[model samples]
Target: MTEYKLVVVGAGGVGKSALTIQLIQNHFVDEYDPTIEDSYRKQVVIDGETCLLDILDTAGQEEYSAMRDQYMRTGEGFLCVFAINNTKSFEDIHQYFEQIKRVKDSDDVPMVLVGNKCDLAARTVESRQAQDLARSYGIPYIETSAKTRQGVEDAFYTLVREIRQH
Candidate 1:
């Protein structure tokens, strides 16, 4: 089976696991606590297609800088995520960009800048800014909310189509 590795990365409480859970399970863990231990994997067909979505759900809180680089280096692509409601987490986007550059060390690899938590649009960051950043990095941009499932499937579909074209 052909597998595509995708990473959902961000700081603590930025909904990395939540979105991953929602994508895999189609629901949320209402009582989720940040202190909980979790590092799980799942395989989903990219929306009834033949391509397998091999997801490696990483820790948003725990430090795994070295391990993150190792796994990311082997990934087909990634979604560099940030919580839209949290401006501080949004500032950390550059760090992920720099890390990927050092690890897979390829501008040839494709990435998609994702601003998560769009369900909380009342506190949204400027979408144009995120898009501009993605443009500067030479990748696509998407705003999503796992809570409402907004753009969740679409985002993955975009990736699937992009990878197929490549």
Candidate 2:
């Protein structure tokens, strides 16, 4: 089976864990304690082919900042996550993308920019803003709600296809 390594990154409380948990298990979690670094592995069929997905969910804390290059080096693809409700998180999104490029030393890396927690109507970062940023980077942008299980699968599936294509 084909195997793909993916890294999930963003500020804390951005639903990175929620999105990963929902993608692998089809379960939505209401609450999650802050993570340090966690790895999840599962075999699933994507694009009509059996594959194994190994996802590394990184800690959102700045204390773990030194470890980011290591994670970025190992990932084949990336999910840049941010909470739609938090403008600060959205503001910091580009730093994560730049870190990946700096660590991996590549401009053509496969990645998806994700806006999580879209179920909340009071979102500070509008979808258009996020899309514009993604477009500037030449990457796909998607919005997801782990609570409602909306657009979660599309984000992961799209990342997988990107990796395969690249």
Candidate 3:
């Protein structure tokens, strides 16, 4: 079976955990608990191929920056996440991209810029801006609402497709 290691990252309370939980368990969580680093495995089929997707749900706290390099090294693909309502969360995505590039030593690393919390109206980062950023990196930009389970599967499936092609 095809195996892929994906890491989910973003600012605290940006719904990284929620998205992963919803995708893997088909459940939505209303409460937020600061994650240190959690790993979840699921067998899924994408494009008619069964694959083992091991996701590492990472802590969004800035203090964990030191550990990011380790995660970057192990991950085959990455989900650089940010909440639409928080511009600061999106602002630092470039940092994660740069670090991933540095650790992987490849500019063509498979990744996606995920804009979560699309259900909220008080968005700080416009979809166009997020699209432009993802375009610059030649990666996909997907918007998801973890609470509503919208675009959550698409985001992960997109990442898995990229990984398979990579």
Candidate 4:
């Protein structure tokens, strides 16, 4: 069977885990615990094809770096997310991408950069800069609001589609 892996990643409170919950479980929360470390693996169907998507949700703690590297080594694709309202989170993405590249198989691996919490862009600290960074990585970028079910599916589907074409 065809298979894929998706790593949902970003700094703490950037809605990485929340986007996973919304995508896999259709659950969204107004508030999330940044200290709670958890991960989930799920299956998804795209374009009439079903595949095992090992979705890894990493914690924001520094100690998880090794485990994050292991996960990235095996990832087939990714949803690199950041919150539109958090500027520091955007800066952290550079470091995150560096780590991913260390273990990543190739530049061919499909990735979609997501700016979560578009609903809060009025309070946003680095919306445009985040989008620009995501684009520079050669990945499609979008602002998503999981609470509103906006761009969540698009992010996943777009990444999956790109992977499929490759």
Best by lDDT: 2
Question: What clash count does candidate 4 reach?
Answer: 0
Error of 4 at 82 (Å): 0.7
- Report lDDT (CA) for all predictions: 0.73, 0.92, 0.91, 0.78
Assess every candidate by TM-score: 0.86, 0.97, 0.97, 0.88
The model with the greater TM-score, 1 or 4, is 4
Ranking of all predicted structures according to TM-score, beginning with the best and ending with the worst: 2, 3, 4, 1
Off by over 4 Å in 3: none
Candidate 2 vs candidate 4: the TM-score winner is 2
In model 3, what is the error at residue 122, expressed in angstroms?
A: 1.0
Writing each residue's lDDT as its tens digit, candidate 3 over 1-166 gives: 8789999987788899999999999988698588999999999888888889999999988888778889988899898899999998999888888888999899999999999999998989999999999999999999999999999999998998898888
Local accuracy of candidate 1 as per-residue lDDT tens digits, 1-166: 6777776676777777777777778986555666333444555566565656766666665476777777678777777788888887778886888788888767766677878888874675788888888888888898888888887777666766666666
Q: What would the TM-score be for candidate 3 when compared with the true structure?
A: 0.97
Which regions in candidate 2 have their CA more than 4 angstroms from the true location? Answer: none
As for lDDT, the candidate ahead, 2 or 4, is 2
Relative to the true structure, candidate 1 has a C-alpha RMSD (angstroms) of: 2.4
- Which 10-residue window in model 1 sums to the lowest lDDT? 35-44
Against the correct fold, how does model 1 do in TM-score? 0.86
